[PDB]
Amino acid sequence: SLLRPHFLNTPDKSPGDRLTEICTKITDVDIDKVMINLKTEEFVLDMNTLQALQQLLQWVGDFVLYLLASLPNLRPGHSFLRDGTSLGMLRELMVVIRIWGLLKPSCLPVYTATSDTQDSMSLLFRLLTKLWICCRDEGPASEPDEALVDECCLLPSQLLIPSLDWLPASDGLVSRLQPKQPLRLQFGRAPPKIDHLRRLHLGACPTEECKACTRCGCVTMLKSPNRTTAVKQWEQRWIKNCLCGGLWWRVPLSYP
């Protein structure tokens, strides 16, 4: 949604669809060869919001790296390895991340690399294309070959797979309940802290107050950190609800 095409070249296709068509017909394993054919004077932002997108792009890169390192092993990523569509989406985001990194290098995700002559984005894109060509086949279900398996075994050696927060921190009663047994509760008794929507690390005991979703359980801080540099296209989606749909519900501070 953010990329506003400055001029309409090859009309009747919006630049989301041009990007998806171009990424689905060009199966090149290099990121440069995909990035060449994509009219890259169109993919321009004002270098302010482009900088403020850093944490979402960080989540994209970290999730891709976690997924590819998780490939040699039921874990938090097991479904995505065989879904061709989601891997296509991850490819498209890596390509637009590469273009936006060439415009401004501060928007890029960071990887702590165990080498200094490394292009980590191109490495992850090579492994992602080689995984995705498995699943973009018609009627395929191709089990991944051993070359990808050993290359993704080399990924903790080349980069550090960080950690990730997974959203449904389950405190719902319906999993806890059983038929023929009622829970007897008291009111107010209640029988690594991140903001999950704007991917900001809160402290050990967070100083700013938070909302929690009532269904999934994601936590966001209540007021935006920087009201000037705020990607309002992303923050204004979750004003009234979470993405899962549930309502927000203010959480009280600890004060330890």
User: In the chain, where does DSSP find H-type helix?
Assistant: 15-25, 31-36, 49-52, 54-70, 84-103, 120-135, 146-153, 155-158, 173-176, 232-235
Query: Is residue 242 close enough to count as binding Zn ion by CB under 5 A?
Result: yes
Footprint (CB under 8 A) of other proteins, residues 192-251: 203-207
CB nearer other proteins, residue 173 or residue 204: 204
Distance CA 119, CA 78 (A): 26
Distance CA 137, CA 24 (A): 11
In the complex, what is the shortest distance from the CB of residue 250 to other proteins, in angstroms, rounded to a whole number?
16
Query: Is residue 216 close enough to count as binding Zn ion by CB under 5 A?
Result: yes
213 three-state secondary structure: strand
Query: Is residue 244 close enough to count as binding Zn ion by CB under 5 A?
Result: yes
- Would you state the structure tokens that stand for residue 255, as one six-digit string? 């004060």
CB nearer other proteins, residue 58 or residue 129: 58
Query: Is residue 255 close enough to count as binding other proteins by CB under 8 A?
Result: yes
Buried b (16+ CB within 10 A) or exposed e, 244-253: eeeebeeeee
Query: Is residue 213 close enough to count as binding Zn ion by CB under 5 A?
Result: yes
Nearest to 248 by CA among 184, 176, 192, 196: 196
Nearest to 24 by CA among 137, 172, 156: 137
Contact status, residue 115 vs residue 14, Cβ threshold 8 Å: no
In the complex, what is the shortest distance from the CB of residue 204 to other proteins, in angstroms, rounded to a whole number?
4
Query: Is residue 254 close enough to count as binding other proteins by CB under 8 A?
Result: yes
The binder of 102, among other proteins, Zn ion, none, by C-beta within 5 to 8 A per type, is none
Q: Which stretch binds Zn ion (CB under 5 A): 124-132, 133-141, 216-224, 231-239?
A: 216-224
In the complex, what is the shortest distance from the CB of residue 221 to Zn ion, in angstroms, rounded to a whole number?
15
The binder of 255, among Zn ion, other proteins, none, by C-beta within 5 to 8 A per type, is other proteins
CB nearer Zn ion, residue 148 or residue 169: 169
- Would you state the structure tokens that stand for residue 153, as one six-digit string? 């075994």
In the complex, what is the shortest distance from the CB of residue 208 to other proteins, in angstroms, rounded to a whole number?
10
- Would you state the structure tokens that stand for residue 86, as one six-digit string? 């989601």
State the residues that interact with Zn ion by CB under 5 A: 213, 216, 218, 242, 244, 246
State the residues that interact with other proteins by CB under 8 A: 203-207, 253-256
